[PDB]
């Protein structure tokens, strides 16, 4: 299911579900990053894996992110996608990020690439405690950089879009059920009294 | 498990069906 990566003040409705990329004058540049804290509010929350996980308290196992390129047929480019295990700040330069787990992606006849986020933890489970900086909760970071450049001819659009998707693998597990924080009420709904009349 | 009622729907919950097939949702292609 689709990630809401473009969760920014200027993006309205369906615009929040895509990331736009364009040609650059400078090498090695950062395009975007994603927080991986699958219990908290963020790009992963409103997904099939995010919604079902928020009924539980502990989780374990591997995730996959898949990206689809939606430019013209004549457009070309290469990207690098990196996962960094936790311990300090998110990396801001390609030469720092490429030391982590990564894949280099070439645009072509196959439209899409998968990055595996492997289960790397000291404990058997991670814990949905209300603290993003806990050693029992933090997962690390995903970051994307230019490996070459987006290159297009004059009759193609100068700007192209990525759609990002996420799912769990079959090593995934959940436990300790709870009331979901995604819904609530302060009053009775409309027409609820008419059931008594 | 204890049940002395005559109608079978009166019984306790059933929590032993571990059969799955994710492929009907993940791979619905010919």
């Amino acid at each position: 299911s689709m990630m809401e990566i473009n969760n920014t003040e200027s993006a309205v409705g369906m615009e929040r579900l895509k990331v736009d990329i364009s040609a650059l004058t400078d090498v090695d540049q950062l395009l975007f990053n994603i927080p991986l804290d699958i219990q908290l509010d963020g790009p992963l929350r409103n997904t099939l894996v995010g919604n079902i996980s928020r009924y539980y308290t502990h989780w374990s196992g591997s995730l996959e992110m898949t990206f689809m390129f939606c430019g013209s047929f004549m457009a070309t480019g290469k990207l690098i996608l990196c996962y960094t295990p936790p311990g300090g700040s998110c990396p801001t330069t390609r030469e720092t990020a490429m030391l982590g787990t990564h894949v280099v992606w070439d645009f072509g006849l196959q439209s899409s690439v998968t990055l595996i986020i492997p289960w790397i933890s000291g404990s058997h489970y991670r814990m949905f405690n209300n603290d993003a900086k806990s050693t029992n909760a933090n997962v690390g970071y995903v970051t994307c950089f230019m490996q070459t450049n987006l290159i297009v001819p004059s009759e193609s659009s100068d700007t192209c879009s990525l759609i990002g998707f996420i799912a769990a693998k079959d090593d995934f597990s959940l436990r300790l059920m709870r009331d979901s924080p995604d819904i609530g009420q302060l009053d009775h709904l409309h027409a609820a009294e008419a059931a008594y009349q | 498990q204890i049940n002395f009622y005559k109608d079978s729907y009166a019984a306790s919950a059933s929590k032993q069906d571990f059969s799955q097939d994710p492929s009907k949702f993940t791979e619905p292609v010919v």
Partner: protein, 297 residues
């Protein structure tokens, strides 16, 4: 292909790859299939033997918990002067799972459901706090709850001859007992209940959209059996439902915006994110901003 799964899957050791014509990390999303790339194909792995169970996410375990479905308060007193809108020592309720949002959102994850329903009834009482009243102790009252089919005749008053219950099921219980309990079977005229219904209930065009009377379980009629005392009390009744013997079909996108009504699926959203009509997730300053970034000192 169908199989029995009691634990999460194992991981196998893997080596270097450099092979022409083989690309397990590339996929074709346009087909509608999910990615089949495995961890052993993406990175070098060790062997791991996995002992994690999967039983707490079984559908019977996920849905079979008792949840609140009705809460009603009424005054137990002499009602000789009360206005016609009053619950005069009795009330009627049409059974539904739409009035309290935590049960509603969980059932609405599926298109069709088949289950038996276990019903539990909890009662409490207090003395009315008018300036003429001290506290005086609390009575151990008897209550009657009668089950009545959808659209059938219901009692008009506390002492109606309709309460004789000659073929209807009734349960009688005291406030000092444990909560009253019974099971209602799967009662639909179809093989499953419809959680959502894209149609109209009747042959004429003027009927209700989205309502299907075949999915309505019935009416519950409740009274105090005792005559009124010389002083007034407030009585509150709570009803709980637990589904059991469950089957479920065709899973659905979860509700994101707040509910408005029990009658329909209408929406409005919050005034600002999260859960606004134009923005479901809370904002950040840019697609390069990391919101909980760790600081080193």
């Amino acid at each position: 292909i169908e199989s029995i799964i009691k634990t999460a899957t194992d991981t196998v050791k893997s080596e270097i790859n450099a092979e022409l014509g083989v690309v397990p990390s590339l996929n074709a999303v346009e087909t509608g299939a999910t990615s089949n790339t495995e961890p052993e194909e993406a990175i070098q792995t060790r062997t791991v033997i996995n002992q994690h169970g999967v039983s707490e996410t079984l559908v019977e375990n996920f849905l079979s918990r008792a949840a609140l479905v009705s809460k009603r308060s009424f005054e137990y007193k002499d009602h000789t002067s009360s206005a016609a809108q009053t619950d005069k020592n009795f009330f009627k309720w049409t059974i539904n799972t739409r009035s309290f949002v935590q049960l509603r959102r969980k059932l609405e994850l599926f298109t069709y459901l088949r289950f038996d329903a276990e019903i539990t009834i909890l009662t409490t009482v207090a003395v009315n706090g008018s300036s003429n009243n001290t506290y005086v102790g609390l009575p151990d009252l008897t209550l009657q709850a009668m089950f009545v089919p959808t659209g059938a005749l219901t009692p008009e008053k506390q002492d109606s001859f309709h309460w004789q219950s000659g073929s209807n099921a009734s349960v009688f219980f005291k406030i000092s007992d444990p909560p009253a309990r019974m099971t209602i079977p799967f009662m639909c005229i179809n093989s499953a209940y419809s959680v959502f219904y894209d149609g109209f209930a009747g042959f004429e065009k003027s009927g209700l959209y989205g309502i299907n009377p075949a999915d309505t379980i019935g009416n519950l009629c409740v009274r105090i059996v005792n005559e009124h005392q010389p002083v007034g009390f407030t009585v509150t009744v709570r009803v709980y439902m637990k589904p059991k013997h469950i089957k479920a079909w065709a899973p659905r996108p979860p509700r994101t915006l707040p509910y408005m009504s029990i009658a329909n699926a209408n929406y409005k959203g919050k005034g600002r994110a999260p859960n606004a009509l134009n923005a479901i997730i809370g904002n950040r300053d840019s697609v390069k901003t990391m919101p909980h970034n760790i600081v080193t000192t």
